[PDB]
Every structure is written in structure tokens, then in C-alpha cells.
Design a protein around this ligand. Structure first.
Ligand SMILES: *[C@]1(OC[C@H]2O[C@@H](O)[C@@H](O)[C@@H](O)[C@@H]2O)O[C@H](CO[C@H]2O[C@H](CO[C@H]3O[C@H](CO[C@H]4O[C@H](CO)[C@@H](O)[C@H](O)[C@@H]4O)[C@@H](O)[C@H](O)[C@@H]3O)[C@@H](O)[C@H](O)[C@@H]2O)[C@@H](O)[C@H](O)[C@@H]1O
Length: 333
């Protein structure tokens, strides 16, 4: 019941049923940012997939549609006017998942049209020998936060359509990103800036989307190297993006990063499921499971009386992005 309790509390605190959007914080003065709203959309989907309560499941399934509808009312159906390719791709990825859950073809169309806009027009072979640009306005940097989500979105589209076009895209994007945006041992770099080079700053959400795309490529291709890729990035996270007690770091004050544990936990759950199914990396699997469970318990021990957990997991206004990670964590496998 913990996942159910956490999701219900999150909705009670942050869901606006009038605007069909999440509030940015408990003051209820501003709705959540566009890109983060896609991530909260995926949280609703994860809760939907996790719960065993048929009543809550039906409510969450409806909410999947309402989140899309509330966003389209404010931002339109065509997001290609947004200069941030990642903003577009986070929504394309969400849309692909919403299709999988609802079977509603509008989500497949949203996913495919937006993925195609970004991949077909924003991939470049010249700078850095490959990669998708962060922006469709100015072309100055190629970033983990667009490239690995794009590989994930391609993998969802492959699974849905069976069109090898999308597997080929995922393979190509990931190969480039592994080569140019990692150290080869699981540290994912933030971006490569033209006239500068790589910026080797690691963050939770970029570890996460790298891990998720690697797991998805493992499953689609049968090539064990991808599982090894995922494990190295999980190990790096567990050892190097934690405090002295092994609790995942707080990445504030940056507003985009503060909630990044949400994306990380979503993707660590994918790795956990694949390790459990396959029996591969059994020693690491045991250590990883124990460490995940520890993080989750520590986070939830800081819940307030309304069952909301601030995103500083080691320690009056609660924010929906920062608070989402603890909810995500209870709505995994
Ligand atoms: C996309 O959203 C764009 C914009 O949309 C607006 O509507 C609104 O929602 C805004 O809030 C959105 O920004 O772009 C997001 C931002 O991407 C850029 O910025 C992030 C964060 O950059 C910072 O952090 C990195 C990483 O390292 C730093 O933090 C770590 C961890 O704490 C430290 O260890 C390290 O020392 C360092 O301090 C850093 O490299 C940057 O210089 C900067 O300090 C980057 O991660 C991106 O690559 C972009 O530069 C993005 O988060 C989303 O994808 C969103 O869709």
C-alpha cells in the first residue's frame, strides 16, 4: 500500500483538477513547468502499472488522459514551436508510454510526429561526429538530456510499431552517446559544447536515461554489452552520486535538477527488473537491491504528516518536482 498512499498524497497536495495540471508547489500559485509535467505524467503511469487497487488504477488511468488534455489546452498539440528539443522529446517519450497503456492512437501520433521532428532534423553528423542538438533555435551544444531520452523514445516506438527504423535510431543515438557523452565506465557527461568540448558533470537524471536506454537496447538486441553498460552506470551512481551514508545526493538549488532522482529511480527500477528476470550480475543485484531499499526507507522516514517527502532525502512549502522522487521510488517493481 505504500506506493498507493504516496501517489494519493501527491495528487491530494499537487494535482489541480480544474486546470488538469500539477501545481509547481503547495502554495498553488503556479503550475508545473512543461518538461517536468511530462515526468509527472510518467509518474502517474508508473503508479497505474504498480497498483493492485482496481479503483485507484481506474482513477490513475483517467488521469493519464487528463494530464495530456490539461497540457494541450495550454501548450497545444504541436510542440515543435518549443525551441528545446528535450522539452519536445520528454513529451514524445511520455506519449509513447501513454499509447502503450491506453491503446489510444492519438498518443502514438504525438510520439511519432515529435520524435521524427527531432531525430530527422536535429541529428547532425558533423559537430562531435554525431548527436542531437539541445535546441532547434541555436546549435551550440549536444546534451545527454536530449540524446538518451531520444534513444528511449525510439525504443518505445520500436516496441510499439516493430519498424526497424526506430531500433536503428536507438542504436545509432546510443552508440554516439556512449562514445562521446560517457567515460566508458558509467559516468555520463552533461553535454558537449561547440568551441569547447565535453562538460563532464554527472547528474541523476542523465545517469537514469542512459541506464534506461541501455536496458531497452539489451532487451531489443540480445547484446549483453548493453546490460554491462547499464550496470556500470548504476555502479557509478551508487558510489559517486551519493552522500557519505550512501543516500542519493540533493542536486538543488537548480530547479531542473532538484527533482532528478525521479527520473533516476524510474530507470533504476528497469535495471532491477531485468537483473531479477535474467539472473545476471547476481552479486551486484543483491547489493543494488539493498542499497535501493535503504534509500527508499531513509527518504520515507522524512515524510511529513501529509505523507509528502521533500527531495532532500538526507534531511513549509513543498514542491512537486522535488517531492515526486519519493513517490516514484514506491511505484517501481
Ligand atoms: C530543458 O528545459 C529547458 C527550460 O525550459 C523552461 O520551460 C523551464 O522548464 C526551465 O526550467 C528549463 O531549463 O532543459 C533543462 C535544463 O538543461 C540545461 O541545464 C541542465 C542543468 O545544468 C546545470 O547543471 C549541470 C550539471 O552539473 C551541475 O550539477 C551537478 C549536480 O548537482 C554538480 O555536481 C556539478 O558540479 C554542477 O554544479 C552543469 O553542467 C550546468 O553547467 C548547470 O550548472 C543541464 O543538465 C542540461 O544539459 C542543460 O544545460 C533540462 O534539465 C531538461 O532536459 C529540460 O527539458
Amino acid at each position: 500500500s505504500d506506493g498507493d498512499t504516496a501517489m494519493k498524497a501527491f495528487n491530494d497536495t499537487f494535482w489541480d483538477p480544474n486546470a488538469k495540471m500539477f501545481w509547481k508547489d503547495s502554495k498553488r500559485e503556479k503550475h508545473q513547468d512543461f518538461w517536468v509535467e511530462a515526468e509527472l505524467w510518467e509518474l502517474v503511469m508508473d503508479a497505474y502499472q504498480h497498483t493492485s487497487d482496481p479503483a485507484l488504477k481506474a482513477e490513475l488511468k483517467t488521469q493519464i488522459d487528463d494530464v495530456y488534455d490539461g497540457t494541450v489546452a495550454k501548450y497545444g498539440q504541436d510542440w515543435t514551436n518549443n525551441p528545446f528539443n528535450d522539452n519536445i522529446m520528454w513529451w514524445a517519450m511520455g506519449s509513447a508510454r501513454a499509447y502503450q497503456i491506453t491503446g489510444n492512437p492519438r498518443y502514438l501520433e504525438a510520439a511519432r510526429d515529435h520524435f521524427d521532428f527531432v531525430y530527422d532534423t536535429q541529428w547532425d553528423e558533423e559537430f562531435a561526429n554525431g548527436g542531437i542538438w539541445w535546441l532547434n533555435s541555436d546549435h551550440n551544444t549536444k546534451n545527454a538530456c536530449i540524446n538518451f531520452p531520444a534513444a528511449q523514445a525510439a525504443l518505445y516506438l520500436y516496441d510499439i510499431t516493430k519498424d526497424e527504423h526506430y531500433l536503428n535510431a536507438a542504436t545509432k543515438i546510443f552508440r554516439w552517446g556512449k562514445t562521446m557523452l560517457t567515460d566508458g565506465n558509467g559516468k555520463v557527461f552533461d553535454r558537449i559544447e561547440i568551441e569547447h568540448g565535453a562538460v563532464p558533470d554527472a547528474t541523476h537524471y542523465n545517469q537514469g536515461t542512459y541506464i534506461g536506454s541501455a536496458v531497452g537496447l539489451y532487451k531489443a538486441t540480445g547484446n549483453a554489452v548493453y546490460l554491462d553498460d547499464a550496470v556500470k552506470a548504476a555502479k557509478f551512481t551508487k558510489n559517486h552520486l551519493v552522500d557519505s551514508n550512501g543516500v542519493l545526493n540533493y542536486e538543488g538549488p537548480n530547479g531542473d535538477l532538484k527533482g532528478g532522482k525521479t527520473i533516476l529511480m524510474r530507470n533504476l527500477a528497469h535495471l532491477q527488473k531485468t537483473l531479477d528476470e535474467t539472473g545476471q550480475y547476481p552479486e551486484f543485484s543483491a547489493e543494488f537491491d539493498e542499497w535501493l531499499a535503504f534509500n527508499i526507507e531513509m527518504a520515507w522516514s522524512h515524510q511529513n504528516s501529509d505523507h509528502i517527502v521533500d527531495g532532500n532525502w538526507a534531511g513549509g512549502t513543498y514542491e512537486s518536482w522535488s517531492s515526486a522522487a519519493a513517490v516514484q521510488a514506491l511505484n517501481g517493481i
